[PDB]
From a paper:
To get a better understanding of the antitoxin function, we determined the high-resolution X-ray crystal structures of the Taq and Mtb [name] macrodomains (TaqDarG-macro and MtbDarG-macro) in a ligand-free or ADPr-bound form. TaqDarG-macro and MtbDarG-macro share the same overall structure with an RMSD (root-mean-square deviation) of 0.89 Å over 149 α-carbons and a 56.4% sequence identity. To probe the requirements for the de-ADP-ribosylation activity of [name], we devised constructs with substitutions of conserved and ADPr pocket-facing amino acids. While some of the mutations (H82A and W83A) showed little or no effect on the de-ADP-ribosylation activity of TaqDarG after 21 min, others (N22A, K29E, G119E, and K80A) had marked inhibitory effects. Interestingly, mutation of K80, the equivalent of the main catalytic lysine residue in TARG1, showed the most significant effect on substrate turnover out of all the mutants tested and resulted in inactive TaqDarG, indicating that this feature is conserved between TARG1 and [name] (Sharifi et al., 2013). N22A showed the most significant effect on substrate turnover after K80A, and because of its location and the effect of its mutation on the enzyme’s activity, it might be involved in the positioning and binding of the ADP-ribosylated thymidine moiety. The reduced catalytic activity observed in the G119E mutant is most likely due to the position of the residue in one of the loops involved in ligand binding. This loop undergoes a conformational change between residues 117 to 122 in order to grasp the ADPr moiety upon ligand binding, with a maximum distance variation of 7.66 Å between the α-carbon of Gly121 in both states.
Numbering used by the authors: -1 to 149
Write the structure that this text describes.
Amino acid sequence: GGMLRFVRGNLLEAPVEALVNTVNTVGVMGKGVALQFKRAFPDNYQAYVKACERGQVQIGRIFVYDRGPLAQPRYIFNFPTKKHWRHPSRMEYVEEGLKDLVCRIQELRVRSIALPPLGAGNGGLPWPEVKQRIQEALEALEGVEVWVYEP
Ligand SMILES: [Cl-]
Ligand SMILES: [Cl-]
Ligand SMILES: [Cl-]
């Protein structure tokens, strides 16, 4: 029963197994979605900082933090949309990230996941095009309920 739904509300409240946080690769969660994630999920933030220090966080390479089998959300999928926090999000980086998103969902047998609009909206990437790429990527997931929070 896989299904893609586009919704409004507080991403952090989504009642799912995995949340996507939109991040950069330099180890800063200072604004926007990432700031909300830093405040809500401090252990993910520290793990993310260490993964960045190691060079593990790169374009097309989601950094997943596991909060444990009894947690909800269990996973934080730290999705890079840009290198430095001052740079804009870039469409190529969202495209490569969405491919890896599918990879990590499958690897981890995640059955429900919620995403922000991946750098779209409010002066960022064009939402119609981002929405289209999300649809292309994430309607080819069998059995996964995907919730996308609109700009
Ligand atoms: Cl940031
Ligand atoms: Cl958020
Ligand atoms: Cl956490």
